[PDB]
């Protein structure tokens, strides 16, 4: 049955083994699905990322197909580009674009972002989301860990491992999926849901960018989820530290009623995003520059 699934994956991935053209694997990152490494392309000297996912170690093995669907069909300026997929023994390997600026998480936990920088990130994420949502793709794991940066401060959405598709025939999803603190209330309440869940999650990531942490981060995951489901929308620790424009923006995101929450396409027209700076404004926040 593991062997059954290896065979299934093989018909869908590129033939061969990327080890034949890649040198110097170094682990840089982690997740639920598996590890992320840097590798050098032997003939060019260029660096790529390689996502390795052990088939035996997945909660829902069939979600590994998400990696291939996104590669094949949904490439975009603000979305991490995937190059090739391979079955290497008991692992799926995805060779993809290396985002050398690292994850938004390292920034969020180590410095304060100004509103020009926050708005830049939000706009980049929302440009991605509005294109994905318009095609029925829901990310389902929006958080700072999923947002990666180039060295010149460009912002890209990654880690599509738990994404899903809605359509006319499948209007809503039902799976309990994501990271507790960032999960939308209707999703925690086990209601059928759609792209709106990404918008809530982004709102939690706005709080990350302001406070350095998502709400109830000091609570156990299961208690946090309960509080998200039962209580009023979570508030900023420091409301005096946001402009009324940023507060207006967040109020459109952290709406409990999914039908009243703003959509990604609506949010692109929000006055708060007018503050967005160029990619260059993000550059000083990175570890190599701080």
């Amino acid at each position: 049955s593991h062997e059954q699934f290896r065979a299934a994956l093989q018909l869908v991935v590129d033939p061969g083994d990327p080890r034949s053209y890649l040198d110097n694997f170094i682990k840089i990152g982690e997740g639920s699905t598996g590890i992320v490494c840097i590798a050098t392309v032997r003939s060019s000297g260029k660096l790529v990322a390689v996502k390795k996912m052990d088939l035996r170690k997945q909660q829902r093995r069939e979600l590994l197909f998400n990696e291939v669907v996104i590669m094949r069909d949904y490439q975009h300026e603000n979305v991490v580009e995937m190059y090739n997929s391979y079955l290497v023994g008991d692992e799926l390997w995805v060779v993809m674009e290396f985002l050398e600026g690292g994850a938004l998480t390292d920034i969020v936990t180590h410095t304060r972002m100004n509103e020009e920088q926050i708005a830049a990130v939000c706009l980049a994420v929302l440009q991605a989301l509005s294109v994905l949502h318009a095609q029925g793709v829901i990310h389902r794991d929006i958080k700072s860990d999923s947002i990666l940066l180039t060295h010149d401060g460009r912002v890209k959405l990654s880690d599509f491992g738990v994404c899903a598709q809605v359509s006319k025939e499948v209007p809503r999803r039902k799976s309990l999926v994501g990271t507790p603190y960032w999960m939308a209330p209707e999703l925690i309440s086990r209601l059928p849901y759609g792209p709106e869940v990404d918008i809530w999650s982004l709102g939690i990531m706005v709080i990350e960018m302001v406070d350095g942490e998502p709400p109830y981060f000091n609570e156990p995951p299961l208690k946090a989820m309960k509080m998200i489901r039962d209580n009023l929308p979570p508030r900023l620790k420091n409301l005096h530290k946001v402009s009324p424009s940023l507060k207006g923006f967040l109020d459109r995101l952290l709406v409990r009623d999914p039908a009243q929450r703003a959509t990604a396409a609506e949010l692109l027209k929000h006055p708060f995003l007018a503050k967005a700076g160029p990619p260059a404004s993000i550059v000083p926040l990175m570890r190599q520059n701080r």
Partner: peptide, 6 residues
Amino acid sequence: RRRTWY
């Protein structure tokens, strides 16, 4: 904890 659920 920063870990995903399925």
